[PDB]
Amino acid sequence: NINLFSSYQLGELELPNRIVMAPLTRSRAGEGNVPHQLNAIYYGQRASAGLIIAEATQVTPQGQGYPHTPGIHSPEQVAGWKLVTDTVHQQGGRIFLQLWHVGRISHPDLQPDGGLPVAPSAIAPKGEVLTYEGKKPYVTPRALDTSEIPAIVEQYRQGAANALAAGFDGVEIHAANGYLIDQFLRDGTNQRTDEYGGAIENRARLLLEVTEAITSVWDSQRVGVRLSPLTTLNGCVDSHPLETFGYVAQALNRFNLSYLHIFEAIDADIRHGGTVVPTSHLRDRFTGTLIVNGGYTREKGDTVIANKAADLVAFGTLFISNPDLPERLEVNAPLNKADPTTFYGGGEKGYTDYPFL
Ligand SMILES: Cc1cc2nc3c(=O)[nH]c(=O)nc-3n(C[C@H](O)[C@H](O)[C@H](O)COP(=O)(O)O)c2cc1C
């Protein structure tokens, strides 16, 4: 008799429901990659979520991969995010910041001094990347030196401390979707021969060291980690995802985190001889709160919470188009249809103008 509307204790935070707004890049940052009042309105409109996870936000300038995503590395960015967290709190909500470093998923045109994007290994992604001059081929990223990995961890640590000064309730470490930490996790993108490559413990080392550093800034119950075991996004694949992600789920127990958040790839069942990483494997392996995500509905989300298969259910696409998604789900209202043409960039249209019930 728990469902999507049941309250939940997440550390010291009292969530009114089990509905989470998934992190959604909207590429609507202002000059200097600073959030602004329109962003504050957008998140304030969605404050009925049990928890909002804000869009991926680069922790350092080299961590940007797409034009006009917000950062959390400068004082102006902290002040713009404070507008957002002030508004969400005024509206009675709770919000965590998703901390990002895109690693190889970038272009020199977006990097300081026009440098190469950094990565575990020098493997160019396939296809094209958007720059300020339009789409261009990806370049081959530079493989970080072993001695540079502490600087990466320290960029995440500072990002987390800036998020604390911005007034967030917590942080989510983006270890999913083929970005930097995921690039280290997966053997398709990591062919290093130091203590950060090879065995799973080595490939997970960057994640674990970033997590340790961030739990020295935040109470650990305010730190979450997102994984996406069966995505193929951004050319980042593991050859043994059950072993890799099962190991990671158990290795994170040390830290007493807020949660583990799993994005279940939408094509996992069909773009496999079935799902090779059942979330139940990770649920067994991680001893804390589990957030699931990917194509959820009222019916699917109620099932997973009733069954104890997950504690929280995050919705991405439906929160783009339904600012009051919890109320709509609760009363079985119609749901507004999301318009992909306004997902990224632009202004209020397709962002703050989806109507309330
Ligand atoms: C426009 C858009 C932007 C996204 N940006 C992010 C992001 O910033 N961080 C992230 O971890 N996932 C991101 N995702 C993935 C979503 O959080 C979510 O996992 C995915 O859309 C599947 O959930 P859904 O079926 O409820 O939409 C994005 C998805 C969309 C559609």
Ligand SMILES: [Cl-]
């Ligand atoms: Cl602390």
